[PDB]
Amino acid sequence: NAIVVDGTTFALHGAGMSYVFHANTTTGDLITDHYGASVSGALPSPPEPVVNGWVGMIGRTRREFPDQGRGDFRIPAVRIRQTAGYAVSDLRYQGHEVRDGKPGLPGLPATFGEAGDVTTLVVHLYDNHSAVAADLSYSVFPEFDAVVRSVNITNKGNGNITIEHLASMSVDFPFEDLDLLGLRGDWAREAHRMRRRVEYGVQGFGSSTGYSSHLHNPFFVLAHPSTTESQGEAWGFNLTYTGSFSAQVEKGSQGLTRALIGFNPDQLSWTLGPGETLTSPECVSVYSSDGIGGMSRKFHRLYRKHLIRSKYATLDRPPLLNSWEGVYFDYNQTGIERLARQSAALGIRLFVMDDGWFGNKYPRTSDKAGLGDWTPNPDRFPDGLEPVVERITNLPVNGTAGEKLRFGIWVEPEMVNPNSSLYREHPDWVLHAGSYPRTERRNQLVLNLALPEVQDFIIDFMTNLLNSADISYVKWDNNRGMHEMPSTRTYHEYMLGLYRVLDTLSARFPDVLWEGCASGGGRFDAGILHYFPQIWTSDNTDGVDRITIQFGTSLAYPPSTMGAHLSAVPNHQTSRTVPLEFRAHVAMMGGSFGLELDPATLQDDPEVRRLIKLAEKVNPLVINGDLYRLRLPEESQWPAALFVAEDGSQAVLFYFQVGPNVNHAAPWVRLQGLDPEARYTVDGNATYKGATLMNLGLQFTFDSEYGSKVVFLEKQ
Amino acid sequence: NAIVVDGTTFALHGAGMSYVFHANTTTGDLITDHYGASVSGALPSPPEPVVNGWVGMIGRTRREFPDQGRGDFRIPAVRIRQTAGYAVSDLRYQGHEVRDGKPGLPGLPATFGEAGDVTTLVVHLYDNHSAVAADLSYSVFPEFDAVVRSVNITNKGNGNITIEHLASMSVDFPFEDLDLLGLRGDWAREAHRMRRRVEYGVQGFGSSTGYSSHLHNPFFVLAHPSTTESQGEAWGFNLTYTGSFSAQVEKGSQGLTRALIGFNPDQLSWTLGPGETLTSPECVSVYSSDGIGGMSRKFHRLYRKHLIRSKYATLDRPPLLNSWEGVYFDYNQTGIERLARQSAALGIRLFVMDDGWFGNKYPRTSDKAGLGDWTPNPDRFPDGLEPVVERITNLPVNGTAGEKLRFGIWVEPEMVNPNSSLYREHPDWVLHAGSYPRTERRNQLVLNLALPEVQDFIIDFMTNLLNSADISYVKWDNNRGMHEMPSTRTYHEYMLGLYRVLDTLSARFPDVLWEGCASGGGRFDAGILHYFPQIWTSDNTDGVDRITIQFGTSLAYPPSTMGAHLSAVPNHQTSRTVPLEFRAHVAMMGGSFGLELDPATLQDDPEVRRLIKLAEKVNPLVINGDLYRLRLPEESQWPAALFVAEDGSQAVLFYFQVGPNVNHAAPWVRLQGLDPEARYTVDGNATYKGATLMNLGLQFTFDSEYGSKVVFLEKQ
């Protein structure tokens, strides 16, 4: 009984969430009644508001699919330029259907589930005067208090129409003070938490790169001002889409707040011919009454159970060594094998050969050539790739007894250098607008994945690459945004093309571990997580800054999803030097731990082998546990996080001291998410009751500029 | 004409400040009218308030010298236990006197000036029921907008009275929003700026250590919430005292705000026999209508001209090398001359021998023995101190053509180790209370400077030490607070003793550079500064923390006063590693630049030598210039300071980037204090108008974790 229909009243009920709206059988419009904690039985209906001035009754109600141009002066969820040239729309309720389970989304990633886990309501709207239909989908995963929404615009007329704006999700909030949380950043500093009070007017963010981007993530939280990581009410929203997007919160004149996410309107002019349909990407919505952190934990469990479809969602990731920051472009066969040998002697189970291996006539010896020609470079691999992959995958891994090293490889399929062979043959494969200059970023242009030719070029050279040697890992990079485009339609057709490609290649190679990447987290979104079980979090590999970046990213996405590598010091992006154990402890909070340096530069082998076994020990709890962000880096210089097994048997605490703490008391870190009346053994020694660890806590002191502790808890 | 008297109205006028109060003919009370920017002529009087409830008229007025116990329930400026046992006091105006110049204070440090720079009004109050006189002094330095206040209480009856509380200055503000600024800290983190809204109730701070302490400085600012370093009204208050203090700011039930500073009342129980007198220390107050930075510049120029009496107040300090961090206790004759030789090799002009040189039967080889025994250790100085100091003062200074190195020494006169000959001889000289444990801090006790025996002991061993070799610099340290006291009287009696000793010694050796110290800034107050031209700012020598520490101290005291040493890395207090040029540039903001490291551990002699020459070049501006804090380290990671010559012909700009600035724009630093129409050549290259440098500014970028720039300006 997760969806309940009485009359025109639709109720979606999770475990501790409820979402209730109804159709007004006088105006035909869908009106929101409640989105929050559980309600049941009869609900109080609001007294009718007195109407004065220009704002009519339509400007005073909470709406679910608001249009503009018939009296509502607030931001709309939809804009349609009709065939006759009006931008008016009057979509009136027509009927509905409830079904158990969740239909797929055509050509797009979506959450999925079976009849027990999820129930779906589709509501049908129709415009009599313009012959346009809109179908609104609502799915409830009741276990996670999640509501997944998406919308369809179908043109049933006889001329064309243009969708000038189409929000995936559109919720109207009652009059109450709200705070908006987002993640903002840029290259080497993605996912910085920002929190601001919602003001009369518009605030929000989006992306115009054509991808979800480093600048803003397609994610935001509305909270009461008093809401913390563990107290109070939060509403999260996540767009399942890798393209441009727009997120907007508007507190209207009357005091109700409108929140909406979907396509970036400015890159959506979607012509619909008679009989065509536009399908928005899904938006996943979570409510929590247990603070922002409760909201995150439901997201994390939902994505790990009903979004990440790869067989690695719950499997542990091998500690890897990536060759980029250790060797950059300057190597050949000889060096790659040197890195692989030192890798397996240290206990690393997977070796990744990053940029620099490909191109022939135009070799990838720098930023400036070879993207597009995806065959090994004979100057560097004279007998091909397969014999080197062969010798690398015969190296035994230290401290393992049995297992041999695995090999992975870097690719950037959507891109081409002008100085390449592919570009010389197919210069029209790239994104461009007529005769305008083809602007480069890092000397490359973007391939037009809206063309089926370009799609099959990528599908084919990756199928051939993965069948040419023993490759069990692919890092799929993407190092610039879209600039000039042959039409506004191409923004979303590129993404439909990329999804066909990612869908084919990941279904075709289910045993490859695929890592997304885009100069780090430039495409860190649920859209990519559907096909890839993990994403390179950031090119910033500095211990101190990775704590801010990993904490912010975990606001929406599960730590299982985050790649994190121990790097060399002084750090190549910050120039900051941080001790080796601090750097490692930070990386162990990523689902996929690894090294990214020349192992020749690290001289304490027993320490490194000791940190790699610790990484393997904590990796199961990071993959499958629940995260409690005990102390945020934004609030203090002692950030801390707690991973609790889903069944409470075990926990691991990461606790850091960032600044020096000169001549001063240290705080107490208090845990949460334990059993108050249970006993827990802390790091094999003392034994405390759950209530003590949660209401008193532990205190750690350091006499150093940087300090860190990884502490294990066993229940009894 | 700085003091205008009209009947019972008293007006104190400065360049842009007026301070106006009057005696109420009917009540005898001194009422404040205005403490702010200039007024003249007739002043508007407040309409009379309506009285309802328990708070009578006395609780609704602005009072100059408030008592309690006659209907004013607000915090009082004085409390006297009369001979009959009452704590009541009705001091009424009897008369006044205006004089040119300014009297000194009996036994206490105080500001000074001759006729043309300062004028003084004394108001006589007298209580006829109890025979108690009180005399309030107001002095105006018109050029600096400074009012200095102090009060004597004289017992003129036939019994004893007790002064249980006596504030040095007390102002009632009208009803208006106020912010309170102070300097808080502890060892190795002195002088952190703090700012808070003033609230209904009490707020403030003080010292219970017997000295002015690292924990709070005897200083505070009242400013409007909108007030910045360069805009708005600010009222500063500074207590010229090295002992315990209390500063309280109370917003009363009616909304007037009472500010008071003076003796700590809990450490003041002063009994006056018939005819006896108590003098409070003076309180300097500065008003500025040009922001908190304008108030500091007036404090800085007033202290340099009218407080710091040493001949070094406006003399350049020689670059010095201190042995403490390079060698600690472990050395003898041979290592001291090594350090001196190497120091002269770098261009260092003054070599200071720090702790560890003294002691005989209980040698000072560590923290645990020898304080009290101020003869040179024969195990470390077999032929005495004079032969070594002779060879040291013969070393020529490199790049100086002629000058010979000077020698300095460290002493801690007010302290004794139980393991010392002094203590076995005179065990009763230490501060103690009967048979209570003599609790130690850093293995030492405090000598009771209230006893003339102790004073004459300190004068004698310092005079014999300074006459026994060619010593031109003394570092007077003091490494613990007071604990047990033979009586409450002793808190102030100690200070009167300490000041007699500092007066005697500092006038007996006017050509020694005296530098105060107390575990860094434990006695960084106007009291010491009267006798010593510079003070060791903090034991923390980390370059990043000294920015905060030095900017903070500069809120009250001039940069010519602050000692700063370039240290080695990793830092001994923080463990931080910071680049040498950064470290060096931070230390050039203090008046006495120095080195505190073993010269053999230097990565670059040529770069050190070039940095010492740069210190000698910036020093005249730091000693005599006006400080403009352009950007505060509490507000961004780009702190900046500007020293402008009094005549505006030259300026030095210090600019810092503290953390890394990864992939992000940098701010503009905008100057101030220049002539908008003059032209100024920047670092011998470009030439810009003053308005351009002030309204647009300069921009600096960095590819590193830590950046710094020292940029010189010359009028044309």
Side-chain angles (χ1 to χ4, degrees), chain A residues 1-382 384-602 604-716, chain B residues 1-382 384-602 604-716:
Chain A
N1 245 333
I3 299 204
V4 168
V5 176
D6 171 343
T8 52
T9 303
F10 314 91
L12 312 100
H13 299 308
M17 175 276 307
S18 271
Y19 188 118
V20 183
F21 59 102
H22 73 266
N24 183 290
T25 66
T26 284
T27 72
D29 194 4
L30 290 180
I31 303 116
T32 324
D33 302 329
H34 178 69
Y35 184 20
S38 282
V39 297
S40 91
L43 318 180
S45 58
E48 194 211 327
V50 158
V51 161
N52 277 287
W54 305 3
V55 183
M57 194 61 70
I58 194 187
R60 290 150 202 281
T61 58
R62 301 164 70 178
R63 309 175 62 186
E64 281 273 308
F65 203 51
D67 74 290
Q68 214 180 47
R70 302 189 296 98
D72 198 350
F73 301 130
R74 295 175 289 183
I75 47 144
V78 65
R79 297 188 136 96
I80 300 199
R81 175 141 306 114
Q82 321 278 1
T83 310
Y86 332 116
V88 184
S89 206
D90 194 12
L91 292 153
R92 283 142 162 275
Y93 168 74
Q94 292 291 118
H96 69 270
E97 261 84 52
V98 177
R99 297 263 315 277
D100 306 314
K102 204 173 167 295
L105 225 40
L108 300 155
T111 58
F112 52 83
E114 294 317 292
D117 304 335
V118 64
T119 311
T120 292
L121 165 72
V122 171
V123 169
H124 300 288
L125 313 183
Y126 183 71
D127 185 337
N128 260 322
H129 315 278
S130 267
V132 166
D135 297 11
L136 278 73
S137 269
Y138 302 72
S139 319
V140 201
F141 299 75
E143 189 182 326
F144 314 99
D145 286 351
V147 170
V148 183
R149 281 182 62 186
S150 47
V151 68
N152 271 32
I153 306 302
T154 307
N155 170 11
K156 304 216 185 139
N158 295 111
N160 294 329
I161 71 175
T162 298
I163 318 304
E164 272 297 330
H165 172 68
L166 180 69
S168 294
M169 177 136 197
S170 211
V171 315
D172 257 336
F173 272 82
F175 167 52
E176 43 174 8
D177 304 345
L178 288 177
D179 282 32
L180 172 71
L181 294 71
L183 302 168
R184 63 102 184 170
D186 199 329
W187 173 87
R189 50 189 181 83
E190 306 96 314
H192 278 44
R193 255 176 94 134
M194 63 175 337
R195 189 172 174 154
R196 56 198 149 304
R197 168 74 54 86
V198 165
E199 309 268 322
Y200 288 96
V202 196
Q203 53 269 285
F205 42 82
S207 169
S208 276
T209 66
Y211 312 101
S212 59
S213 89
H214 307 86
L215 322 181
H216 296 275
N217 198 272
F219 174 81
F220 72 87
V221 180
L222 287 171
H224 292 328
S226 46
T227 293
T228 60
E229 284 290 313
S230 51
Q231 286 136 53
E233 294 192 282
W235 294 264
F237 302 85
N238 197 21
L239 192 65
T240 308
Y241 188 55
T242 314
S244 297
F245 75 89
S246 200
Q248 294 166 82
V249 174
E250 189 205 51
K251 188 188 233 223
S253 77
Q254 286 302 319
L256 319 166
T257 291
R258 194 171 271 169
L260 78 79
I261 199 182
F263 300 115
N264 177 3
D266 310 327
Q267 315 173 342
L268 194 272
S269 265
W270 196 270
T271 294
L272 278 182
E276 303 186 9
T277 298
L278 179 55
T279 298
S280 80
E282 100 189 317
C283 174
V284 176
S285 199
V286 163
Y287 168 81
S288 178
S289 83
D290 315 298
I292 288 153
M295 180 216 68
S296 279
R297 282 189 298 282
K298 299 181 225 194
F299 269 109
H300 298 164
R301 197 51 77 192
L302 186 68
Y303 290 163
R304 271 176 301 183
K305 274 177 90 264
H306 299 283
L307 181 81
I308 308 148
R309 87 195 186 186
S310 147
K311 83 165 167 82
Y312 280 89
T314 281
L315 299 187
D316 297 30
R317 320 298 163 65
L320 67 75
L321 185 119
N322 188 289
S323 81
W324 171 240
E325 269 186 26
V327 161
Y328 282 106
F329 291 99
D330 173 49
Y331 64 88
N332 56 36
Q333 268 197 28
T334 279
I336 289 319
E337 292 190 348
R338 174 183 73 79
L339 296 171
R341 268 193 316 276
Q342 313 186 273
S343 277
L346 285 172
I348 293 97
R349 294 166 142 296
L350 166 75
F351 166 82
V352 183
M353 179 182 55
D354 207 89
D355 205 330
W357 63 270
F358 51 99
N360 180 7
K361 195 162 313 286
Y362 311 95
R364 184 75 169 179
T365 62
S366 69
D367 259 6
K368 290 166 184 163
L371 275 181
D373 321 320
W374 296 100
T375 50
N377 173 15
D379 298 310
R380 298 178 154 193
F381 301 92
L385 199 81
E386 50 292 349
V388 175
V389 167
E390 230 284 339
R391 286 191 297 280
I392 283 180
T393 45
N394 283 333
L395 290 177
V397 186
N398 181 278
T400 280
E403 310 284 19
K404 296 216 223 63
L405 189 78
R406 292 161 54 173
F407 183 80
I409 207 177
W410 180 98
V411 289
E412 181 171 1
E414 296 148 75
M415 309 281 160
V416 59
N417 290 109
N419 192 30
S420 72
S421 283
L422 165 84
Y423 188 76
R424 247 165 270 264
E425 185 198 35
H426 301 300
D428 253 28
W429 275 10
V430 316
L431 290 176
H432 73 281
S435 71
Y436 281 94
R438 280 153 188 214
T439 59
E440 280 159 38
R441 174 82 287 273
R442 198 167 104 134
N443 318 120
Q444 38 188 95
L445 309 175
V446 182
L447 287 184
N448 181 349
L449 261 64
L451 307 192
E453 311 72 340
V454 163
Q455 294 165 24
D456 290 330
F457 163 78
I458 289 164
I459 301 187
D460 277 82
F461 93 75
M462 292 289 296
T463 294
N464 172 243
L465 181 55
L466 285 162
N467 291 328
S468 78
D470 202 358
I471 294 174
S472 34
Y473 173 103
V474 172
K475 175 141 109 79
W476 177 305
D477 208 343
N478 192 94
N479 283 296
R480 68 160 271 189
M482 310 173 183
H483 299 179
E484 307 79 2
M485 299 284 278
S487 63
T488 299
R489 200 183 184 88
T490 310
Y491 280 112
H492 184 55
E493 275 167 349
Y494 182 116
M495 284 311 314
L496 291 173
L498 179 69
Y499 285 140
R500 167 167 111 83
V501 167
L502 296 182
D503 192 6
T504 311
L505 290 181
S506 71
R508 188 172 293 181
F509 298 91
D511 295 314
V512 164
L513 175 55
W514 300 84
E515 179 167 318
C517 181
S519 315
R523 302 206 284 203
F524 205 130
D525 48 74
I528 288 277
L529 292 165
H530 192 245
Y531 312 101
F532 294 175
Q534 72 183 49
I535 293 178
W536 182 231
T537 310
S538 167
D539 278 331
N540 198 325
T541 52
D542 184 59
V544 165
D545 287 341
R546 267 308 188 112
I547 311 181
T548 287
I549 292 165
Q550 289 168 207
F551 269 63
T553 303
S554 96
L555 196 46
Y557 307 110
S560 71
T561 283
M562 293 169 14
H565 298 163
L566 190 175
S567 269
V569 288
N571 175 262
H572 296 162
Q573 308 91 26
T574 60
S575 321
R576 171 146 68 198
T577 288
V578 162
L580 169 76
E581 184 190 76
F582 191 102
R583 261 178 284 146
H585 287 165
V586 171
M588 297 177 197
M589 311 172 80
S592 100
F593 171 94
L595 274 37
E596 198 187 275
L597 41 77
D598 196 319
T601 61
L602 54 83
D604 202 354
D605 292 353
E607 192 57 29
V608 178
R609 302 204 273 270
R610 186 203 78 67
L611 290 165
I612 293 166
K613 299 316 178 180
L614 186 67
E616 293 190 319
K617 183 181 190 220
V618 312
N619 199 239
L621 276 170
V622 176
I623 303 282
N624 287 290
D626 298 312
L627 171 66
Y628 299 78
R629 289 178 301 271
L630 293 192
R631 302 175 55 89
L632 298 175
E634 297 84 43
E635 312 168 329
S636 85
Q637 76 177 270
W638 305 275
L642 184 63
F643 288 88
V644 184
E646 201 187 350
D647 50 293
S649 56
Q650 288 143 311
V652 58
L653 166 87
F654 294 88
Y655 172 98
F656 304 96
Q657 178 211 272
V658 181
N661 187 52
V662 163
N663 177 36
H664 198 276
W668 286 75
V669 53
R670 301 165 50 176
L671 286 48
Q672 45 190 260
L674 300 182
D675 188 332
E677 263 303 274
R679 284 185 186 50
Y680 299 87
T681 304
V682 171
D683 256 19
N685 311 134
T687 303
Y688 305 109
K689 298 72 206 165
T692 308
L693 289 156
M694 282 187 286
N695 308 327
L696 212 172
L698 305 167
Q699 172 173 68
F700 302 112
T701 55
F702 301 94
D703 200 27
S704 51
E705 160 180 31
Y706 297 109
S708 74
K709 301 212 36 181
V710 179
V711 173
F712 288 100
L713 295 88
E714 198 189 337
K715 207 206 256 220
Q716 283 102 13
Chain B
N1 269 38
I3 298 188
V4 174
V5 184
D6 186 26
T8 51
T9 311
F10 308 100
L12 288 64
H13 302 283
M17 175 279 292
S18 283
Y19 186 112
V20 181
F21 61 106
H22 70 275
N24 183 321
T25 73
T26 285
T27 72
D29 217 17
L30 286 187
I31 289 111
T32 314
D33 301 310
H34 177 68
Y35 186 14
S38 276
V39 299
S40 85
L43 308 192
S45 34
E48 168 152 281
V50 317
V51 170
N52 266 82
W54 300 6
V55 183
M57 200 58 75
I58 189 191
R60 300 161 189 266
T61 52
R62 305 170 54 185
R63 300 175 74 199
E64 281 284 310
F65 201 55
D67 79 293
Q68 223 175 57
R70 300 199 289 99
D72 192 1
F73 307 126
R74 292 173 284 175
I75 56 169
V78 64
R79 202 182 329 259
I80 298 172
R81 181 185 97 240
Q82 309 287 357
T83 309
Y86 333 120
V88 182
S89 211
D90 190 345
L91 293 149
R92 270 162 194 252
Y93 164 86
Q94 306 279 105
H96 73 253
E97 191 238 20
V98 189
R99 285 213 149 230
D100 252 4
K102 172 174 194 291
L105 229 47
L108 296 159
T111 49
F112 52 85
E114 271 307 324
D117 313 325
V118 66
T119 313
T120 280
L121 164 89
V122 161
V123 180
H124 307 287
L125 319 181
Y126 191 81
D127 170 340
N128 271 295
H129 303 265
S130 289
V132 179
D135 271 38
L136 291 133
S137 292
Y138 303 80
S139 293
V140 201
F141 294 82
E143 161 182 7
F144 313 110
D145 287 340
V147 180
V148 191
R149 292 181 48 177
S150 52
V151 63
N152 312 7
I153 309 282
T154 306
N155 176 15
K156 283 158 99 201
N158 308 305
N160 298 341
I161 71 191
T162 292
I163 313 309
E164 278 291 288
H165 172 53
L166 180 66
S168 300
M169 169 149 205
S170 211
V171 299
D172 277 343
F173 276 71
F175 169 53
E176 70 179 79
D177 292 328
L178 289 182
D179 268 2
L180 172 69
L181 283 84
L183 300 172
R184 62 158 271 254
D186 193 320
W187 175 85
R189 48 187 178 84
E190 298 88 339
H192 281 37
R193 257 180 80 138
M194 66 169 325
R195 182 159 179 171
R196 39 150 141 193
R197 180 78 18 107
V198 165
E199 291 301 340
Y200 286 93
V202 202
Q203 57 269 302
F205 44 78
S207 188
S208 277
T209 70
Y211 312 102
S212 49
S213 83
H214 317 93
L215 321 182
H216 294 284
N217 204 265
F219 169 76
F220 68 88
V221 185
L222 291 183
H224 286 146
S226 42
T227 297
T228 67
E229 287 288 307
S230 42
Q231 297 141 65
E233 294 169 81
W235 294 259
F237 302 83
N238 203 19
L239 184 74
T240 310
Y241 192 53
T242 312
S244 286
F245 76 93
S246 183
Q248 308 160 74
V249 179
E250 179 200 49
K251 210 189 207 260
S253 77
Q254 296 293 312
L256 311 162
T257 292
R258 184 165 288 169
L260 79 98
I261 191 181
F263 292 118
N264 175 2
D266 311 327
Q267 308 202 328
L268 206 248
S269 162
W270 199 272
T271 294
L272 297 170
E276 289 191 0
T277 304
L278 178 59
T279 295
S280 75
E282 56 161 32
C283 166
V284 187
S285 187
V286 167
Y287 163 85
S288 181
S289 82
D290 302 309
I292 287 153
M295 173 225 80
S296 293
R297 287 184 297 279
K298 304 167 190 201
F299 267 115
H300 299 165
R301 192 61 68 178
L302 173 74
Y303 283 163
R304 277 180 285 179
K305 292 187 173 286
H306 297 286
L307 178 70
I308 302 157
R309 73 194 203 166
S310 153
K311 87 159 162 87
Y312 279 95
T314 43
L315 278 195
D316 287 21
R317 323 294 156 76
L320 71 77
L321 185 126
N322 179 296
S323 79
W324 171 239
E325 270 189 26
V327 153
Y328 281 113
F329 291 100
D330 318 276
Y331 64 87
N332 53 47
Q333 257 187 10
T334 70
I336 287 302
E337 323 165 47
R338 166 180 79 63
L339 291 168
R341 282 177 247 133
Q342 270 142 18
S343 286
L346 296 170
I348 286 303
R349 278 184 218 210
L350 160 68
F351 168 71
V352 180
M353 175 166 72
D354 211 279
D355 189 3
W357 58 272
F358 52 91
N360 190 12
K361 295 171 244 132
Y362 310 82
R364 179 75 164 189
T365 58
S366 70
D367 266 358
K368 297 116 216 148
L371 291 188
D373 304 338
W374 301 101
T375 58
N377 183 354
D379 273 357
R380 302 174 158 210
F381 298 84
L385 196 70
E386 206 279 342
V388 196
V389 176
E390 167 80 11
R391 296 181 297 271
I392 288 187
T393 51
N394 286 340
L395 308 173
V397 195
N398 184 55
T400 210
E403 310 280 6
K404 311 261 184 273
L405 190 65
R406 297 161 66 177
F407 179 84
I409 199 161
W410 179 94
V411 295
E412 192 171 355
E414 304 150 65
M415 302 289 159
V416 66
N417 280 130
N419 308 318
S420 86
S421 290
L422 191 276
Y423 187 74
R424 296 320 291 286
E425 189 49 84
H426 307 292
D428 50 305
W429 283 7
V430 301
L431 284 172
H432 72 280
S435 152
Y436 279 99
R438 295 163 174 216
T439 62
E440 300 166 25
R441 175 84 277 286
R442 182 188 209 213
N443 318 107
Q444 27 166 119
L445 300 178
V446 186
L447 291 170
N448 181 354
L449 263 77
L451 316 165
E453 298 97 287
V454 170
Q455 301 160 29
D456 292 335
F457 164 83
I458 291 162
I459 301 171
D460 292 335
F461 89 73
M462 292 289 284
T463 303
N464 160 279
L465 173 63
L466 283 175
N467 283 325
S468 68
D470 186 16
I471 301 173
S472 50
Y473 170 104
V474 172
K475 185 160 149 129
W476 187 298
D477 205 0
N478 180 296
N479 296 101
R480 58 161 289 188
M482 303 184 191
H483 302 189
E484 306 87 359
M485 298 301 275
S487 82
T488 297
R489 200 169 185 89
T490 319
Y491 285 108
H492 188 47
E493 284 235 34
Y494 181 115
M495 284 325 302
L496 295 177
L498 169 57
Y499 285 139
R500 174 178 100 90
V501 164
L502 293 192
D503 187 27
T504 300
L505 283 175
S506 87
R508 187 168 296 174
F509 299 95
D511 296 303
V512 169
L513 181 55
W514 297 84
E515 170 172 322
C517 182
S519 302
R523 269 142 60 128
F524 210 124
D525 55 81
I528 298 285
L529 275 185
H530 183 56
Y531 308 102
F532 294 173
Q534 69 192 53
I535 306 200
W536 184 230
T537 319
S538 170
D539 272 346
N540 199 321
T541 58
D542 172 87
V544 165
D545 288 345
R546 275 297 201 106
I547 295 178
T548 298
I549 285 167
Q550 294 177 203
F551 272 67
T553 306
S554 88
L555 186 54
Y557 311 100
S560 74
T561 280
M562 297 173 22
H565 296 172
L566 194 171
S567 284
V569 284
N571 177 270
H572 296 177
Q573 299 85 60
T574 71
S575 295
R576 232 203 299 282
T577 286
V578 163
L580 167 92
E581 170 155 65
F582 191 105
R583 277 181 269 147
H585 289 164
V586 178
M588 289 166 202
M589 302 179 76
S592 99
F593 172 90
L595 282 183
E596 205 167 301
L597 67 313
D598 191 336
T601 318
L602 297 177
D604 218 331
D605 261 39
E607 204 63 351
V608 164
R609 265 180 273 102
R610 184 198 70 78
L611 289 163
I612 291 144
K613 282 179 269 256
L614 173 69
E616 293 181 346
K617 177 187 175 181
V618 316
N619 199 240
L621 267 171
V622 163
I623 299 284
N624 301 285
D626 293 310
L627 174 68
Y628 296 84
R629 286 178 301 261
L630 302 185
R631 314 172 48 99
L632 288 192
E634 319 74 333
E635 285 246 70
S636 81
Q637 66 176 281
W638 300 275
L642 177 74
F643 290 87
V644 185
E646 211 171 0
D647 54 289
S649 59
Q650 316 175 336
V652 186
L653 164 71
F654 298 87
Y655 180 93
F656 301 96
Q657 172 207 266
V658 170
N661 189 39
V662 168
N663 181 30
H664 191 280
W668 287 76
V669 46
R670 282 165 54 176
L671 289 304
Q672 47 189 279
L674 307 179
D675 183 356
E677 270 297 87
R679 288 162 319 114
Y680 295 91
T681 296
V682 180
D683 263 346
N685 309 142
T687 305
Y688 303 112
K689 278 250 158 36
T692 285
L693 287 162
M694 290 193 284
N695 302 338
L696 204 183
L698 303 166
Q699 178 169 81
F700 309 112
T701 60
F702 297 100
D703 164 67
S704 65
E705 38 156 21
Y706 296 109
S708 63
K709 273 201 128 294
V710 175
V711 169
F712 288 94
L713 271 74
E714 215 180 45
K715 219 150 153 303
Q716 295 119 31

